[PDB]
């Protein structure tokens, strides 16, 4: 099977929110504070 086990590989799709995209797609997915305690 796939790594997921769910549906797919990763949080129901990629190319959608934080992962494909990491040069700065995911530093403004990292919109606010309140993602973890070390902020």
């Known amino acids: 099977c ?3 086990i769910r549906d797919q ?3 129901f799709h990629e190319d ?3 992962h ?3 040069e700065l ?3 403004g ?3 606010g504070s309140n993602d973890l ?3």
């Open 9 to 11: 590989l990763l949080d």
């Open 16 to 18: 959608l929110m934080t």
């Open 29 to 31: 997915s990292l919109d």
């Open 2 to 4: 796939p790594e997921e």
């Open 37 to 39: 305690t070390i902020r």
């Open 25 to 27: 797609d995911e530093d």
């Open 20 to 22: 494909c995209g990491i």
